[PDB]
Design an enzyme around this catalytic site. Structure first.
Site, PDB file in Angstrom:
ATOM      1  CB  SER A  52      -0.937  -0.004   1.207  1.00 30.06           C
ATOM      2  OG  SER A  52      -1.962  -0.925   0.967  1.00 30.06           O
TER       3      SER A  52
ATOM      4  CE1 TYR B  16      -0.997   1.282  -6.740  1.00 30.64           C
ATOM      5  CE2 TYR B  16      -0.333  -0.119  -4.918  1.00 30.64           C
ATOM      6  CZ  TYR B  16      -0.665   0.049  -6.260  1.00 30.64           C
ATOM      7  OH  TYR B  16      -0.682  -1.004  -7.124  1.00 30.64           O
TER       8      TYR B  16
ATOM      9  CD  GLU C 108      -2.686  -5.869  -6.481  1.00 32.46           C
ATOM     10  OE1 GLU C 108      -3.758  -5.486  -7.061  1.00 32.46           O
ATOM     11  OE2 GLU C 108      -1.510  -5.675  -6.933  1.00 32.46           O
TER      12      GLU C 108
HETATM   13  C1  LIG Z   1      -6.535   6.551  -8.784  1.00 33.61           C
HETATM   14  C2  LIG Z   1      -6.902   6.546  -7.284  1.00 33.61           C
HETATM   15  N1  LIG Z   1      -6.550   5.187  -6.824  1.00 33.61           N
HETATM   16  C3  LIG Z   1      -6.012   4.936  -5.625  1.00 33.61           C
HETATM   17  O1  LIG Z   1      -5.808   5.806  -4.778  1.00 33.61           O
HETATM   18  C4  LIG Z   1      -5.652   3.429  -5.411  1.00 33.61           C
HETATM   19  C5  LIG Z   1      -4.649   3.339  -4.271  1.00 33.61           C
HETATM   20  C6  LIG Z   1      -4.287   2.009  -3.945  1.00 33.61           C
HETATM   21  N2  LIG Z   1      -4.192   0.995  -4.810  1.00 33.61           N
HETATM   22  C7  LIG Z   1      -3.863  -0.277  -4.386  1.00 33.61           C
HETATM   23  C8  LIG Z   1      -3.737  -1.295  -5.316  1.00 33.61           C
HETATM   24  C9  LIG Z   1      -3.349  -2.578  -4.897  1.00 33.61           C
HETATM   25  C10 LIG Z   1      -3.065  -2.828  -3.570  1.00 33.61           C
HETATM   26  C11 LIG Z   1      -3.158  -1.787  -2.637  1.00 33.61           C
HETATM   27  C12 LIG Z   1      -3.529  -0.522  -3.064  1.00 33.61           C
HETATM   28  C13 LIG Z   1      -3.631   0.546  -2.157  1.00 33.61           C
HETATM   29  O2  LIG Z   1      -3.381   0.454  -0.950  1.00 33.61           O
HETATM   30  N3  LIG Z   1      -4.004   1.771  -2.637  1.00 33.61           N
HETATM   31  C14 LIG Z   1      -8.298   6.868  -7.179  1.00 33.61           C
HETATM   32  C15 LIG Z   1      -9.287   5.907  -7.506  1.00 33.61           C
HETATM   33  C16 LIG Z   1     -10.645   6.227  -7.417  1.00 33.61           C
HETATM   34  C17 LIG Z   1     -11.013   7.539  -7.011  1.00 33.61           C
HETATM   35  N4  LIG Z   1     -12.302   7.859  -6.982  1.00 33.61           N
HETATM   36  C18 LIG Z   1     -13.384   7.159  -6.570  1.00 33.61           C
HETATM   37  C19 LIG Z   1     -14.493   7.896  -6.830  1.00 33.61           C
HETATM   38  N5  LIG Z   1     -14.079   9.042  -7.415  1.00 33.61           N
HETATM   39  C20 LIG Z   1     -12.750   9.006  -7.535  1.00 33.61           C
HETATM   40  C21 LIG Z   1     -10.019   8.487  -6.714  1.00 33.61           C
HETATM   41  C22 LIG Z   1      -8.687   8.142  -6.791  1.00 33.61           C
END
Ligand SMILES: C[C@H](NC(=O)CCc1nc2ccccc2c(=O)[nH]1)c1ccc(-n2ccnc2)cc1
Length: 354
Positions: free
Chosen positions: A244, A247, A336
């Site tokens: 995590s 990210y 994941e």
């Molecule tokens: C592009 C961003 N994505 C993240 O912050 C994902 C972060 C994340 N990804 C992972 C993937 C695999 C394993 C762990 C993680 C994790 O801890 N965080 C995001 C995704 C969706 C939204 N969102 C949702 C509704 N409107 C906007 C806003 C930001």
């Protein structure tokens, strides 16, 4: 006629968090880090319409990437007209692979949450008429409609959380714990109450951009039409903090690099385990409540403990990662954990880490 600004009720750590998560510099930094042209797309000019149009633009590119349609160059050029990018005034590059398409979809998702934080801060009418106003940080805190309670070192869950961080974070440069807040976003309570019969609850990491923290605090973790990744259209978590943390971008503040990570309670129910990527998933297979892309390692299950949260037992890993022989050939180095309904997660903790 001059309004009284009331004294701030927040402790210094919370004041700092509320400063950080609404900071115009932080938002603009985030836009610069995603290659956006901040001069042409200033924060006060971001609109929901613009963002909608950008997603339509990407939808047209996605169709082309799977006829006599417009070339990828023309359709890219449209997207860039809608969402201005900065590449040192060179001409931006064509969106011509699935990987880059998902990167742009993820950029717009971040931008959607930046726009939400701006929309949220709009001054209401009752605020223009009252003769006294809260301190700006009290006002910004109140906009979240989310209770945050800073924990001290002897809160019952504190050592358990610290242990989860330390044991599953990077071995060589583990993030340093600064603060933990308990998060009580009400109106998460009822939907999560739905899954009360669903055993198998786990406390899991979700790391993000500082620019989406305000949005998450207002609305919880969400799935959007363009959400995607290695395990499809769901909400992603990890049992290893180090996964995590990858990210978290983290913003330079003085001589430190500040970042935020959530812990969510996830009602995993009946788990479907996979060992190869599937970006096309939109739900678990029939009869399952989650998908776990199983990594080569997992925090040592023999060391799992439990916390009691709203009268339910919630598993919290406490062990260093160990090899899982059945998944030694998995495409995933670390697990994941996926849910495909927003009601299956409740936010429980927010951590500041340096
Ligand atoms: C592009 C961003 N994505 C993240 O912050 C994902 C972060 C994340 N990804 C992972 C993937 C695999 C394993 C762990 C993680 C994790 O801890 N965080 C995001 C995704 C969706 C939204 N969102 C949702 C509704 N409107 C906007 C806003 C930001």
């Amino acid at each position: 006629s001059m309004k009284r600004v009331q004294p701030c009720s927040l402790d210094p750590a919370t004041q700092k968090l509320i400063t950080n998560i609404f900071s115009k510099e932080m938002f603009k930094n985030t836009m610069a880090l995603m290659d956006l042209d901040v001069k042409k797309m200033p924060l006060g000019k971001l609109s929901k319409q613009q963002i909608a149009r950008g997603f339509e633009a990407l939808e047209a590119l996605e169709e082309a990437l799977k006829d006599g349609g417009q070339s990828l160059e023309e359709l890219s050029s449209h997207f860039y007209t809608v969402i201005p990018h900065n590449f040192g005034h060179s001409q931006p590059p064509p969106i011509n692979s699935p990987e880059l398409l998902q990167a742009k979809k993820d950029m717009l998702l971040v931008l959607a949450d930046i726009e939400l934080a701006q929309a949220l801060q709009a001054v209401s009418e009752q605020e223009k008429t009252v003769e006294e106003v809260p301190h700006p940080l009290d006002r910004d805190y109140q906009l979240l409609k989310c209770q945050l309670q800073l924990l001290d070192s002897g809160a019952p869950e504190y050592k358990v959380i610290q242990t989860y961080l330390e044991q599953t974070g990077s071995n060589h440069r583990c993030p340093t714990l600064q603060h933990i807040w308990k998060v009580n976003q009400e109106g998460e309570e009822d939907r999560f109450q739905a899954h009360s019969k669903l055993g198998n609850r786990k406390l899991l990491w979700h790391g993000t951009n500082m620019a989406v923290v305000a949005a998450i605090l207002t609305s919880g973790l969400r799935i959007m039409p363009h959400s995607g990744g290695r395990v499809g259209k769901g909400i992603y978590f990890a049992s290893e903090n180090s996964k995590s943390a990858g990210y978290v971008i983290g913003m330079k503040c003085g001589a430190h690099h500040v970042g935020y990570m959530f812990l969510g309670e996830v009602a995993l129910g009946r788990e479907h385990h996979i060992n190869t990527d599937n970006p096309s998933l939109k739900s678990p297979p029939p009869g399952f409540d989650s998908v776990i892309a199983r990594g080569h390692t997992e925090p040592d299950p023999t060391q799992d403990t439990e916390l009691e949260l709203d009268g339910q037992q919630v598993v919290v890993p406490q062990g260093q990662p160990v090899p899982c022989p059945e998944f030694s050939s998995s495409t995933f180095s670390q697990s994941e954990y996926l849910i495909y309904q927003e009601s299956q997660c409740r936010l429980r903790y927010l951590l500041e880490v340096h």
